[PDB]
Coordinates of C-alpha atoms and ligand atoms in Angstrom, one line a residue:
Chain A
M1 CA -14.4 5.1 -13.2
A2 CA -17.7 6.5 -12.1
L3 CA -17.8 9.0 -15.0
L4 CA -17.1 12.1 -12.7
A5 CA -20.4 15.0 -15.0
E6 CA -22.8 12.4 -12.9
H7 CA -21.4 13.0 -9.4
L8 CA -20.6 16.6 -9.4
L9 CA -20.2 18.0 -6.0
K10 CA -22.6 20.4 -4.6
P11 CA -22.5 23.8 -5.1
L12 CA -21.5 26.0 -1.7
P13 CA -24.0 27.8 0.1
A14 CA -23.9 31.9 1.3
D15 CA -22.8 29.8 4.6
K16 CA -19.4 27.6 2.9
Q17 CA -20.7 24.7 5.2
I18 CA -20.0 21.3 3.5
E19 CA -22.8 18.5 4.5
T20 CA -20.5 15.4 5.4
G21 CA -23.1 12.5 4.2
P22 CA -22.9 14.2 0.2
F23 CA -19.4 14.7 0.1
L24 CA -18.7 11.6 1.0
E25 CA -20.8 10.1 -0.8
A26 CA -19.5 12.1 -3.5
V27 CA -15.9 11.3 -2.9
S28 CA -16.4 7.5 -3.1
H29 CA -16.2 7.9 -6.8
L30 CA -13.4 9.2 -6.9
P31 CA -9.9 6.7 -5.3
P32 CA -10.6 4.4 -9.0
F33 CA -9.1 7.7 -10.2
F34 CA -5.5 5.9 -9.0
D35 CA -6.6 3.1 -11.5
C36 CA -6.5 4.6 -14.6
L37 CA -2.8 5.6 -13.5
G38 CA -2.5 1.3 -15.1
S39 CA 0.1 0.5 -12.3
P40 CA -0.2 -1.4 -9.8
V41 CA 2.0 0.9 -8.2
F42 CA -0.7 3.2 -7.7
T43 CA -2.2 1.0 -5.3
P44 CA -0.7 1.8 -2.4
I45 CA -2.0 5.5 -2.9
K46 CA -5.4 4.3 -4.2
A47 CA -5.7 2.8 -0.7
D48 CA -4.3 5.0 2.0
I49 CA -6.8 7.3 0.2
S50 CA -9.7 5.4 0.8
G51 CA -8.7 5.1 4.2
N52 CA -9.6 8.0 5.0
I53 CA -13.2 8.0 3.7
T54 CA -14.2 5.3 5.1
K55 CA -12.9 6.0 8.9
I56 CA -14.8 9.8 8.0
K57 CA -17.9 7.7 6.9
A58 CA -17.3 5.3 9.9
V59 CA -17.0 8.3 12.6
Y60 CA -20.3 10.0 10.6
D61 CA -22.6 6.7 10.5
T62 CA -21.8 7.0 14.4
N63 CA -24.4 10.0 14.6
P64 CA -25.6 11.7 11.6
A65 CA -27.0 14.5 12.8
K66 CA -24.2 15.8 15.2
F67 CA -21.6 15.7 12.4
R68 CA -23.8 16.9 9.7
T69 CA -21.2 18.9 8.1
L70 CA -17.7 19.1 8.0
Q71 CA -16.7 21.9 10.7
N72 CA -19.0 19.7 13.1
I73 CA -16.7 16.7 12.7
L74 CA -13.7 19.5 14.2
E75 CA -16.0 20.6 16.6
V76 CA -17.3 17.7 17.9
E77 CA -14.4 15.2 17.7
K78 CA -12.3 18.6 19.5
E79 CA -14.9 18.5 22.3
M80 CA -13.6 14.6 22.6
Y81 CA -10.6 13.7 22.0
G82 CA -9.9 17.6 23.9
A83 CA -5.3 18.9 23.9
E84 CA -4.2 15.7 21.1
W85 CA -6.6 17.0 18.9
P86 CA -6.7 17.5 16.0
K87 CA -4.0 15.0 15.5
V88 CA -6.9 11.9 15.9
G89 CA -10.0 10.7 14.3
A90 CA -11.6 11.7 11.0
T91 CA -10.5 15.5 11.7
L92 CA -6.8 13.7 10.8
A93 CA -8.0 11.4 8.1
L94 CA -9.3 14.5 6.7
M95 CA -6.4 15.9 6.9
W96 CA -4.8 13.5 5.0
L97 CA -7.4 13.1 1.9
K98 CA -8.0 17.1 1.9
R99 CA -4.0 16.8 0.5
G100 CA -5.3 14.0 -1.7
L101 CA -8.1 15.3 -2.8
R102 CA -6.1 18.6 -3.9
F103 CA -3.8 16.8 -5.7
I104 CA -5.8 14.6 -7.7
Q105 CA -7.2 19.1 -8.5
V106 CA -4.3 20.9 -9.3
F107 CA -3.7 17.1 -12.2
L108 CA -6.8 17.7 -13.5
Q109 CA -6.8 21.1 -13.7
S110 CA -3.2 21.0 -15.4
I111 CA -4.4 18.6 -18.1
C112 CA -6.7 20.3 -19.1
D113 CA -5.9 24.1 -19.0
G114 CA -3.2 22.3 -21.5
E115 CA -0.1 21.9 -19.9
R116 CA 2.6 19.8 -20.8
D117 CA 6.5 19.5 -21.6
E118 CA 6.7 20.6 -24.7
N119 CA 9.9 18.1 -25.9
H120 CA 7.2 15.0 -24.1
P121 CA 4.1 16.4 -24.3
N122 CA 1.9 13.1 -24.7
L123 CA 3.5 12.6 -21.3
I124 CA 1.7 13.6 -17.5
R125 CA 5.2 13.5 -14.9
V126 CA 4.8 17.8 -15.3
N127 CA 1.3 17.9 -14.3
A128 CA 1.8 14.7 -11.6
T129 CA 4.6 16.9 -10.2
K130 CA 2.8 19.6 -10.4
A131 CA 0.2 18.6 -8.1
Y132 CA 2.8 16.7 -5.9
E133 CA 4.7 19.5 -5.0
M134 CA 1.4 22.5 -4.5
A135 CA -0.4 19.5 -2.5
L136 CA 1.7 16.8 -0.7
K137 CA 5.7 17.3 -1.3
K138 CA 6.0 19.6 2.0
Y139 CA 4.8 16.2 4.3
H140 CA 7.2 14.3 3.4
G141 CA 10.6 13.0 4.4
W142 CA 13.2 12.3 1.6
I143 CA 12.3 9.0 1.5
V144 CA 8.9 9.4 0.6
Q145 CA 10.4 12.0 -1.9
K146 CA 12.4 9.6 -3.0
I147 CA 9.1 6.9 -3.6
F148 CA 7.4 9.4 -5.5
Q149 CA 10.0 10.3 -7.8
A150 CA 10.6 6.7 -8.5
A151 CA 6.6 6.2 -9.0
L152 CA 6.9 8.9 -11.7
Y153 CA 7.7 6.9 -14.2
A154 CA 5.4 4.1 -14.6
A155 CA 2.8 6.8 -15.0
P156 CA 1.2 6.3 -17.5
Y157 CA 1.0 8.4 -21.1
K158 CA -1.1 11.6 -21.8
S159 CA -3.5 9.4 -23.8
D160 CA -3.6 6.5 -22.7
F161 CA -4.8 7.9 -19.0
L162 CA -7.1 10.4 -20.8
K163 CA -8.5 7.1 -22.3
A164 CA -9.1 5.3 -18.8
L165 CA -10.6 7.9 -17.1
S166 CA -13.6 7.7 -20.7
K167 CA -14.1 3.8 -20.4
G168 CA -17.6 3.2 -20.9
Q169 CA -18.6 6.6 -22.9
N170 CA -17.5 6.2 -26.4
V171 CA -16.6 9.8 -26.4
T172 CA -14.0 12.5 -27.5
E173 CA -10.3 13.0 -25.2
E174 CA -11.8 16.8 -26.0
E175 CA -15.0 15.7 -24.4
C176 CA -14.3 14.0 -21.6
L177 CA -11.4 16.7 -20.6
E178 CA -14.4 19.1 -21.3
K179 CA -17.0 16.5 -18.4
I180 CA -13.6 17.0 -16.7
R181 CA -13.9 20.4 -16.6
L182 CA -17.3 20.3 -15.1
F183 CA -16.1 18.4 -12.6
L184 CA -13.6 20.6 -11.7
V185 CA -15.8 23.6 -10.1
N186 CA -17.4 22.7 -7.3
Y187 CA -14.5 20.1 -6.7
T188 CA -12.4 22.6 -6.7
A189 CA -13.9 25.5 -4.4
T190 CA -15.1 22.6 -1.3
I191 CA -11.8 21.6 -1.4
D192 CA -10.4 25.3 -1.2
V193 CA -13.1 26.0 1.4
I194 CA -11.5 22.5 4.0
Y195 CA -8.3 24.1 3.6
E196 CA -9.4 27.1 5.4
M197 CA -11.1 25.7 7.4
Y198 CA -8.2 23.2 8.5
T199 CA -6.4 27.0 9.1
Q200 CA -9.5 29.0 10.4
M201 CA -9.9 25.6 13.4
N202 CA -6.1 25.2 13.3
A203 CA -7.3 21.7 12.5
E204 CA -3.5 22.2 10.5
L205 CA -0.6 20.2 11.1
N206 CA 3.1 20.0 9.7
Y207 CA 4.1 16.5 10.6
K208 CA 6.1 15.2 7.9
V209 CA 5.8 10.6 7.4
Chain B
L1 CA 7.2 -13.1 19.3
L2 CA 7.6 -15.3 16.3
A3 CA 9.3 -17.7 18.9
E4 CA 6.3 -19.8 19.9
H5 CA 4.5 -19.6 16.7
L6 CA 6.3 -22.7 15.3
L7 CA 5.0 -24.6 12.3
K8 CA 4.9 -28.4 12.0
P9 CA 7.2 -30.6 11.3
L10 CA 6.8 -31.6 8.2
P11 CA 5.6 -35.2 7.4
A12 CA 7.3 -38.0 5.4
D13 CA 5.0 -37.2 2.1
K14 CA 5.8 -33.3 2.2
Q15 CA 2.1 -32.4 1.4
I16 CA 0.6 -29.3 3.6
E17 CA -1.6 -28.7 5.6
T18 CA -3.9 -25.0 3.8
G19 CA -5.6 -24.9 7.7
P20 CA -2.3 -25.4 9.9
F21 CA -0.4 -23.7 7.2
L22 CA -2.2 -20.1 7.0
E23 CA -2.9 -20.1 11.3
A24 CA 1.0 -19.8 11.4
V25 CA 1.5 -17.7 8.6
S26 CA -1.3 -15.3 10.4
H27 CA 1.5 -14.5 13.5
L28 CA 4.3 -13.3 10.6
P29 CA 2.9 -9.7 9.2
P30 CA 3.5 -7.9 12.6
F31 CA 7.0 -8.9 11.6
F32 CA 7.3 -5.6 8.8
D33 CA 5.9 -3.1 11.9
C34 CA 8.9 -4.3 13.7
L35 CA 10.6 -2.3 11.0
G36 CA 9.2 0.7 12.8
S37 CA 7.9 3.2 9.6
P38 CA 4.9 3.4 7.7
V39 CA 6.8 2.4 4.5
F40 CA 6.6 -0.6 5.4
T41 CA 2.7 -0.4 5.9
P42 CA 1.9 -1.2 2.0
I43 CA 4.3 -4.3 2.3
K44 CA 2.4 -5.6 5.4
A45 CA -0.8 -4.9 3.6
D46 CA 0.4 -6.9 -0.1
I47 CA 1.5 -10.3 1.9
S48 CA -1.8 -10.5 4.7
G49 CA -4.1 -9.9 1.0
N50 CA -2.2 -13.2 0.1
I51 CA -3.1 -15.2 3.1
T52 CA -6.6 -14.2 2.8
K53 CA -6.9 -14.8 -1.1
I54 CA -5.8 -18.4 0.5
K55 CA -7.7 -18.6 3.4
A56 CA -11.0 -17.4 1.5
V57 CA -10.7 -19.9 -1.2
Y58 CA -9.6 -22.6 1.7
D59 CA -12.8 -20.9 3.4
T60 CA -15.6 -22.8 0.5
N61 CA -14.5 -26.2 0.2
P62 CA -12.0 -26.9 3.6
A63 CA -11.2 -30.6 2.0
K64 CA -11.5 -30.3 -1.3
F65 CA -8.0 -27.9 -0.2
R66 CA -6.9 -29.7 2.9
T67 CA -3.5 -29.5 1.2
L68 CA -1.1 -26.8 -0.4
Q69 CA -0.6 -29.7 -2.9
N70 CA -4.7 -30.0 -3.5
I71 CA -4.9 -26.1 -3.9
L72 CA -2.3 -25.8 -7.3
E73 CA -4.8 -29.3 -8.8
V74 CA -8.3 -27.8 -8.5
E75 CA -7.2 -24.7 -9.5
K76 CA -5.0 -26.0 -12.5
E77 CA -8.3 -27.8 -13.9
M78 CA -11.1 -25.3 -12.6
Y79 CA -8.8 -22.5 -15.0
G80 CA -6.5 -23.8 -17.8
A81 CA -5.7 -21.3 -19.3
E82 CA -5.7 -18.4 -16.8
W83 CA -3.6 -21.3 -13.7
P84 CA -1.4 -20.6 -12.5
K85 CA -1.9 -16.5 -12.5
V86 CA -4.7 -17.0 -10.8
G87 CA -7.0 -17.7 -7.5
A88 CA -4.6 -19.2 -4.6
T89 CA -2.2 -20.7 -6.4
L90 CA -0.3 -16.5 -7.7
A91 CA -1.7 -15.5 -4.2
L92 CA 0.7 -18.7 -2.6
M93 CA 3.2 -18.3 -5.6
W94 CA 4.0 -14.6 -4.5
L95 CA 2.9 -15.5 -0.1
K96 CA 6.0 -18.1 -0.5
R97 CA 8.4 -15.1 -1.7
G98 CA 7.8 -12.6 1.2
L99 CA 8.2 -15.4 3.5
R100 CA 11.7 -16.7 1.8
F101 CA 12.2 -12.4 2.3
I102 CA 11.3 -12.7 5.9
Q103 CA 12.9 -16.4 5.8
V104 CA 16.6 -15.4 4.4
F105 CA 16.3 -11.7 6.1
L106 CA 16.4 -13.2 9.5
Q107 CA 18.8 -16.1 8.7
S108 CA 21.5 -13.5 8.0
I109 CA 21.0 -11.6 11.4
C110 CA 21.6 -14.4 13.1
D111 CA 24.5 -15.5 11.5
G112 CA 25.9 -12.8 12.1
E113 CA 25.7 -11.4 8.6
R114 CA 26.6 -7.4 8.9
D115 CA 28.9 -4.2 7.2
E116 CA 31.8 -3.5 9.3
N117 CA 32.0 -0.4 8.7
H118 CA 27.5 0.1 10.3
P119 CA 27.9 -3.1 11.7
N120 CA 24.3 -1.6 13.7
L121 CA 22.8 -1.6 10.7
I122 CA 20.4 -3.4 8.8
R123 CA 21.0 -3.6 5.4
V124 CA 23.5 -5.8 3.5
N125 CA 20.7 -8.3 5.3
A126 CA 17.7 -6.7 4.0
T127 CA 19.2 -6.1 0.4
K128 CA 19.9 -10.2 0.1
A129 CA 16.7 -11.5 1.1
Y130 CA 15.7 -9.2 -1.3
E131 CA 18.2 -10.3 -3.6
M132 CA 17.3 -14.5 -2.9
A133 CA 14.3 -14.0 -2.6
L134 CA 12.1 -10.4 -4.5
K135 CA 14.0 -8.3 -6.6
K136 CA 14.0 -10.7 -9.7
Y137 CA 10.1 -10.6 -10.0
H138 CA 11.0 -6.9 -10.2
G139 CA 11.3 -4.4 -13.1
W140 CA 13.6 -1.1 -12.2
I141 CA 10.5 1.3 -10.8
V142 CA 9.7 -1.4 -8.1
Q143 CA 13.4 -1.9 -7.5
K144 CA 14.8 2.1 -7.2
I145 CA 11.7 2.5 -4.7
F146 CA 13.1 -0.4 -2.3
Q147 CA 16.1 0.9 -2.9
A148 CA 14.3 4.0 -1.5
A149 CA 12.5 2.0 1.5
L150 CA 16.3 0.5 3.1
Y151 CA 16.6 4.0 4.8
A152 CA 14.0 3.6 6.8
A153 CA 14.4 0.5 7.9
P154 CA 15.6 0.4 12.1
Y155 CA 19.3 -0.1 13.4
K156 CA 20.1 -4.0 14.7
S157 CA 19.8 -3.5 18.3
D158 CA 16.6 -1.5 18.1
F159 CA 14.9 -4.3 15.4
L160 CA 16.0 -7.1 17.6
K161 CA 14.0 -5.5 20.4
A162 CA 10.7 -4.9 18.6
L163 CA 11.4 -9.1 18.2
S164 CA 11.3 -9.3 21.9
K165 CA 8.8 -6.9 22.9
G166 CA 7.8 -8.6 26.6
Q167 CA 10.0 -10.8 27.3
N168 CA 13.7 -9.6 29.1
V169 CA 15.8 -11.7 26.8
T170 CA 19.2 -10.4 25.4
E171 CA 19.9 -9.3 21.9
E172 CA 21.5 -13.0 21.4
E173 CA 18.6 -15.2 23.7
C174 CA 16.6 -13.4 21.2
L175 CA 18.9 -15.0 17.9
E176 CA 18.5 -18.6 19.5
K177 CA 14.6 -18.2 19.2
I178 CA 14.9 -17.0 16.6
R179 CA 17.1 -19.7 14.3
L180 CA 15.2 -22.3 17.0
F181 CA 12.0 -20.8 14.8
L182 CA 13.8 -20.5 11.4
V183 CA 14.5 -24.7 10.9
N184 CA 9.9 -25.6 10.9
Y185 CA 9.9 -22.4 8.6
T186 CA 13.2 -22.4 6.0
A187 CA 12.1 -26.2 4.8
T188 CA 8.3 -25.6 4.6
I189 CA 9.2 -22.9 2.7
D190 CA 11.4 -25.1 0.5
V191 CA 8.4 -27.5 0.0
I192 CA 6.6 -24.5 -1.7
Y193 CA 9.1 -23.8 -3.6
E194 CA 9.6 -27.0 -5.6
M195 CA 6.2 -28.1 -5.4
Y196 CA 5.9 -25.6 -7.6
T197 CA 8.2 -26.4 -9.4
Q198 CA 6.7 -29.9 -10.1
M199 CA 3.6 -28.6 -10.5
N200 CA 4.5 -25.9 -13.6
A201 CA 2.9 -23.8 -11.4
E202 CA 5.3 -20.8 -11.1
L203 CA 5.6 -17.6 -12.9
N204 CA 8.9 -15.2 -13.7
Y205 CA 6.4 -11.9 -14.6
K206 CA 7.8 -8.8 -13.2
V207 CA 5.9 -5.8 -11.4
Ligands
LIG1 C1 10.2 -4.5 -3.1 C2 9.3 -3.0 -2.7 C3 8.7 -2.7 -0.7 C4 8.8 -0.8 -0.8 C5 7.7 -1.1 -0.4 C6 8.0 1.3 -0.6 C7 6.2 1.6 0.1 C8 6.1 2.9 -0.1 C9 5.4 3.5 -0.5 C10 3.8 4.1 0.9 C11 3.5 5.4 0.4 C12 2.1 5.4 0.5 C13 1.1 6.6 0.1 C14 0.5 6.8 1.4 C15 1.7 6.5 2.8 C16 0.7 7.5 4.0 O1 1.9 6.5 5.1 C17 0.8 9.0 3.7 C18 0.1 9.6 4.9 O2 -1.0 8.4 5.7 C19 -1.5 8.7 6.7 O3 -0.9 9.1 7.7 C20 -1.7 9.6 8.7 C21 -0.7 8.8 10.7 O4 -0.1 10.3 10.1 C22 -3.1 8.2 9.3 O5 -2.7 6.9 9.5 C23 -3.7 8.2 8.4 O6 -5.2 8.0 7.9 S1 -6.2 7.6 8.4 O7 -7.5 7.7 7.9 O8 -5.8 7.4 9.8 O9 -6.3 9.9 8.7 C24 -3.0 7.9 6.3 O10 -3.3 8.1 4.8 N1 -0.5 9.9 3.6 C25 -0.6 10.1 2.1 O11 1.2 10.7 1.8 C26 -1.4 11.1 0.9 C27 -1.5 9.3 0.3 C28 -0.3 9.7 -0.9 C29 -0.9 10.6 -2.2 C30 -0.1 10.9 -3.2 C31 -0.4 11.0 -4.4 C32 -0.1 11.0 -5.4 C33 1.1 10.1 -6.7 C34 1.4 10.7 -7.5 C35 1.2 10.0 -8.6 C36 2.0 10.1 -10.2
LIG2 C1 4.2 10.0 -2.9 C2 4.4 8.8 -3.6 C3 3.8 7.6 -4.1 C4 4.6 6.3 -4.5 C5 3.6 4.6 -3.8 C6 3.9 3.7 -4.5 C7 4.3 2.6 -3.9 C8 5.3 1.3 -4.2 C9 3.9 0.3 -3.7 C10 5.2 -0.9 -3.8 C11 5.6 -1.6 -2.7 C12 4.2 -2.2 -1.8 C13 4.7 -4.4 -2.4 C14 3.9 -4.3 -3.3 C15 4.4 -5.0 -4.6 C16 3.1 -5.8 -6.2 O1 3.2 -5.1 -6.8 C17 4.1 -7.1 -5.9 C18 3.0 -7.8 -6.8 O2 1.8 -8.6 -6.2 C19 1.0 -9.8 -6.5 O3 0.6 -9.4 -7.8 C20 -0.7 -10.3 -8.1 C21 -0.9 -10.3 -9.5 O4 -0.1 -9.5 -10.2 C22 -1.9 -10.8 -7.0 O5 -2.3 -9.7 -7.3 C23 -1.3 -11.0 -5.8 O6 -2.2 -11.0 -4.6 S1 -2.9 -12.1 -4.6 O7 -3.3 -12.2 -3.3 O8 -4.2 -11.3 -5.5 O9 -2.7 -12.7 -5.5 C24 -0.1 -9.3 -5.5 O10 0.4 -10.0 -3.8 N1 4.5 -7.3 -4.3 C25 5.7 -8.1 -4.0 O11 6.3 -7.1 -4.4 C26 5.7 -8.6 -3.3 C27 5.5 -7.5 -1.2 C28 6.1 -7.4 -1.1 C29 7.6 -8.0 0.3 C30 8.8 -6.7 -0.4 C31 9.4 -7.1 1.7 C32 10.7 -6.8 0.8 C33 11.1 -5.2 1.9 C34 12.0 -4.4 2.4 C35 11.7 -3.8 4.1 C36 13.5 -3.8 4.4

């Protein structure tokens, strides 16, 4: 874990445009969040979210100036691929990535807000389930949804998850949550803006895996 | 095709050349794309990962690791406490089980094994393979994950068509070709398992 208060996202400008370059650099630090769950069953997840970032970084690298914002990627790739857009290139990679980013976002906000099953307060299952539901559930068929619920056991204890995050520092659970809460700030704002862009561009697809 | 990329027959001393073992097995991971589902992508990725770790250790010194047995001999001397849960020994320890999964599964279909109520499914075949290669190394969470994924298995007819692809071969001619591949294949795997037993190189930990 890279320390997330050390890798804040940029604030939103008046025009709401997100610079691809700093965005990807920022989000490259996030896939290790899945190592903090403490189980090999989450490694396909880590690998899949990395995949997206890698693809967007690759496309970006081709021409940093033409793909300078995220809005650009969608515009330019639509000229490139025509009718096949948006199921293509970095538009497709950011479509799925924005969903995993929202999972991390809703999940952490949940843990920060103190949400919990009162019967089982050192579990993180209700936080995960809520995150999953409002970020991913909709784009998963029967099989992957059953795979999710199997995988929800083998989620760690809250205290252990929060201890896995805070690694390198000598920081308390409530201080760690302070650093997370500050991260969430431009993180949420930015994810929110990407979702609206997908809606405005008609780049959002509903197909299930 | 698995057909053409046959494994070499074993020599009488039973040592497996590391180079040529890696060439052969490297054709195998596209076995899971014959399953026609994204759910199998992480399986394919794990097997490929084993192959690569072995490929890599081999590459630091081809001559020191001419054989797979050589690999296990060297790495024992090299790590003591950590071995066999280390390096290419761990990679091959797991590769062999995926290899046995493929072996057992294809043998099952070739033998005509089927559920008579669902004869165009391959669920019984995959279960048998899973039970006799992998299941005992998975905890109940992972096993529950296998039983969910099993519903993404393709139909037998489609699965055999994917195996065939470019050919114009019957379902049966396809199977005929697979039987030929299984001969040298089963035997090499058998020998790898045996080497892991003689070397105390086997671990029974569950994931
Ligand atoms: C015997 C045992 C063997 C059984 C094997 C069974 C394995 C089955 C499990 C597979 C699930 C792994 C997660 C990744 C699934 C992915 O398939 C999907 C769609 O994946 C996308 O697909 C696109 C094409 O449609 C592009 O290729 C994308 O890529 S592109 O770069 O080409 O554009 C790619 O990410 N991603 C998504 O569902 C998102 C990833 C999952 C997010 C989950 C986060 C929350 C989880 C809760 C944590 C408590
Ligand atoms: C949206 C919801 C999110 C949920 C997503 C969760 C996805 C679930 C992930 C589990 C499925 C992936 C299969 C991989 C499981 C692996 O955990 C194990 C152990 O794997 C080994 O671990 C070692 C350390 O102990 C080394 O790292 C190995 O490697 S090393 O190279 O580093 O030495 C590594 O292969 N492999 C294995 O269990 C076997 C491989 C799979 C074979 C299965 C074939 C059966 C398929 C049936 C087809 C009909």
